[PDB]
Amino acid sequence: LRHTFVVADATLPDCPLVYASEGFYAMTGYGPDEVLGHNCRFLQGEGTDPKEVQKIRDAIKKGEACSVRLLNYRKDGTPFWNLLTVTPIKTPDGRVSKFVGVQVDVTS
Ligand SMILES: *[C@@]12=NC3=[C]C([C])=C([C])[C]=C3N([C][C]([O])[C]([O])[C]([O])[C]OP([O])([O])=O)C1=NC(=O)[N]C2=O
Numbered sequence: 001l002r003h004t005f006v007v008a009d010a011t012l013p014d015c016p017l018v019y020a021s022e023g024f025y026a027m028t029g030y031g032p033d034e035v036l037g038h039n040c041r042f043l044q045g046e047g048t049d050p051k052e053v054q055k056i057r058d059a060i061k062k063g064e065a066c067s068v069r070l071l072n073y074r075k076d077g078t079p080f081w082n083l084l085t086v087t088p089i090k091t092p093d094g095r096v097s098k099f100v101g102v103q104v105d106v107t108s
Contacts (some may be wrong), residue, residue, distance in 0.1 A: 001104060002104070002105070003023070003102050003103065003104045004020070004024040004027050004102070004103045004104075005020070005021040005023070005024065005100070005102055005103075006019060006020045006021070006022050006024055006040065006099070006100070006101045006103070007019040007020075007054065007098055007099075007100055007101075008039075008040065008085070008098060008099040008100075008101065009098060010060075010088070010089075010096045010097055010098055010099055011097060012041075012100075014039050015039055015040075015060060015099055016036075016037050017035055017036060017037070017038060017039070017040055018037075018040055018098075019036075019037060019087070020032070020035055020036070024103065027074075027080075027103070028043060028072075028074055028075060029041055029074040029075030029076055029106060031074050032040075032061075034075075038107045040101070043072040043082070043090070044070070044071075044072060044073070045071070045072070045077075045079070045101040047071045047079065048070055048071050048072070049070070049071065050099035052061075052068045052069065052070055052072070053068075055068050056068055056084070056086060059086065060086065060088075060099060063076045063088045064088065065085070065086060065087045065088060066085070066086055067083075067084065067085040067086075068084050069081060069082070069083050069084070069106070070082045070084055074089045080105050080107050081105065082104070082106070083101050083104040083105075083106040084101060084102075084103050085098050085101065085102045086100070086101045087099065087100045087101075097103060
């Protein structure tokens with residue numbers, strides 16, 4: 001399964017991405033300069049299902065893992081279907097420190 005992987009910093013209030021695999025930058029068209037420090041939601045656009053988006057929003061607030069199918073757009077504006085799975089990573093005191101995300105392009 002060809003997949004990409006990113007880390008978001010839950011200690012900052014809008015979960016900015018702090019690490020992305022080589023595949024994430026090659027799949028999306030975006031450089032580190034335009035990804036690090038930003039919330040993953042820039043990948044979204046006109047056809048992205050707000051119902052699915054909201055499922056991720058809620059799981060992140062409730063600190064649960066979650067898995068959704070989103071329509072994302074590359075930097076050149078072409079779309080692709082992104083099967084996204086976000087996992088919360090907690091410290092020993094139960095608090096959420098990072099969210100890790102695996103993304104798979106499932107356009108087949
Ligand atoms: C994105 N991947 C991704 C990876 C991680 C680890 C996290 C925490 C989130 C994402 N998102 C979603 C985005 O950050 C945000 O959570 C959602 O837009 C919903 O919340 P908001 O506040 O915006 O309503 C990813 N979103 C994508 O579209 N593509 C991914 O690869």
